[PDB]
């Protein structure tokens, strides 16, 4: 149902961050996870005595959490943090799996850490180098219209999309490294079909 | 030094597996991590009084590449959806320089690691399937010295970096037999001590 696919997406957008050093606060966390997408919010455990060592970071989109998942299982001054999906995924797993399946019918990729000055056509040009693009569009603040550093690209061909992730992830663009990954949800996840 | 590059490789071959459910034993762990490479050994915490394990263990592979793939691929579920967490060992500090040094040298080669290679596939089979992404300089499966039977994994070297990149991008999780190859970029140079 629309409401269910909505609650799965919500859960799909969260990552458990564990083993947070004791001096580290929401700001270091935020700073360390933002390259995968603008942080929507963060829930840090709280104790008497400072946080219980863990938190929950929520992105605006599932793709961000997936990239963060895959890329942050590492060090906040060699091995401290562990990253993972939230524990109450069970009941939502069916729809999530259902979503991952629908996503495969599209050759859609997610791009993050897009420098503020790059525009849509810039994105289109760099990326259209792996294949004919059906669409490439950066997300933006409705109020302002300024793009929020990430977006989605749709290729005509699966190989094109595959080549792009393989080639452009961690690609140095400005003093920033793009974070690229395959979409984990279909374009508009809940119409009527 | 030869001895130092040796101790880094040793550390590079280990992954911390955490949040192990309380009934799970060394066998489930072994079974869940072997697709990335044959397990050399496993060290499971133990509580001498409770009379059970402390929830974590240390799995050692025969090679660093296995641990890297396992690292990247097992941060997931052993009954539920999310139980296990995977990571590198905590005493990497002193060895980080050499490890970084190793990762740097590895980039001068277009070498990939392939695991979960079915027992019947031979070297040339590997060569053929993979030579489809580029001219291969070498493709060779590891084997038991005693027996000579290949141990399910091996290394391939392409002439070109794009070839190697296309292969990992294309062949990882590639269904070959009732097995899915685990492919990844080498993390060490061919013979890290000469």
UniProtKB/Swiss-Prot annotation, chain B:
What role does this protein play?
DNA- and RNA-binding protein, involved in several nuclear processes such as pre-mRNA splicing, apoptosis and transcription regulation. In association with FUBP1 regulates MYC transcription at the P2 promoter through the core-TFIIH basal transcription factor. Acts as a transcriptional repressor through the core-TFIIH basal transcription factor. Represses FUBP1-induced transcriptional activation but not basal transcription. Decreases ERCC3 helicase activity. Does not repress TFIIH-mediated transcription in xeroderma pigmentosum complementation group B (XPB) cells.
Tell me the gene name. Answer: PUF60
Q: Where's the RRM domain?
A: 13-91, 110-188
Q: What tissue specificity does the UniProt entry give?
A: Isoform 2 is expressed in colonic epithelium and colorectal epithelium cancer (at protein level). Isoform 6 is expressed in colorectal epithelial cancer but below detection level in colonic epithelium. Expressed in heart, brain, placenta, lung, liver, skeletal muscle, kidney, pancreas, spleen, thymus, prostate, testis, ovary, small intestine, colon and peripheral blood leukocytes.
Outcome reported for the amino acid change (mutating residue 53 to Y): In VRJS; loss of function mutation; results in altered dosage of different PUF60 protein forms and abnormal splicing profile of several target genes
The similarity annotation says: Belongs to the RRM half pint family.
Domain notes from UniProt: The third RNA recognition motif, called PUMP domain, is atypical and may rather mediate homodimerization and/or protein-protein interactions.
- How does it associate, per the subunit comment? Homodimer. Associates with the spliceosome. Found in a complex with RO60 and Y5 RNA. Found in a complex with FUBP1 and far upstream element (FUSE) DNA segment. Interacts directly with ERCC3. Interacts with CDK7 and GTF2H1. Interacts with SRSF11/P54. Does not interact with ERCC3 in xeroderma pigmentosum complementation group B (XPB) cells. Interacts with ARGLU1; interaction may be involved in ARGLU1-mediated modulation of alternative splicing.
- List-wise, which residues carry N6-acetyllysine? 135
Question: Where is it located?
Answer: Nucleus
UniProt-recorded name of the protein: Poly(U)-binding-splicing factor PUF60
- At what positions is Phosphoserine found? 128
Q: What else is known?
A: Does not repress TFIIH-mediated transcription in xeroderma pigmentosum complementation group B (XPB) cells.
Clinical disorder: Verheij syndrome: A syndrome characterized by growth retardation, delayed psychomotor development, dysmorphic facial features, and skeletal, mainly vertebral, abnormalities. Additional variable features may include coloboma, renal defects, and cardiac defects.
């Amino acid at each position: 149902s629309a409401a269910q696919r909505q609650g799965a997406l919500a859960i799909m957008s969260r990552v458990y961050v564990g083993s947070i050093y004791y001096e580290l606060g929401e700001d270091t966390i935020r700073q360390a996870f933002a390259p995968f997408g603008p942080i929507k919010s963060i829930d840090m455990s709280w104790d008497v005595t400072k946080h219980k060592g863990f938190a929950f970071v929520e992105y605006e989109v599932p793709e961000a959490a997936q990239l963060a998942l895959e890329q942050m299982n590492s060090v906040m001054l060699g091995r401290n943090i562990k990253v993972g999906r939230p524990s109450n995924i069970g009941q939502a797993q069916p729809i999530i799996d259902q979503l991952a399946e629908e996503a495969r019918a599209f050759n859609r990729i997610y791009v993050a850490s897009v420098h503020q000055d790059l525009s849509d056509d810039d994105i289109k040009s760099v990326f259209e180098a792996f294949g004919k693009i059906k669409s490439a569009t950066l997300a933006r603040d409705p109020t302002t219209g300024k793009h929020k550093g990430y977006g989605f690209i749709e290729y005509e061909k699966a190989q094109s999309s595959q080549d792009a992730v393989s080639s452009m992830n961690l690609f140095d663009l400005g003093g920033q490294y793009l974070r690229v990954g395959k979409a984990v949800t279909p374009p508009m996840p809940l119409l009527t079909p």
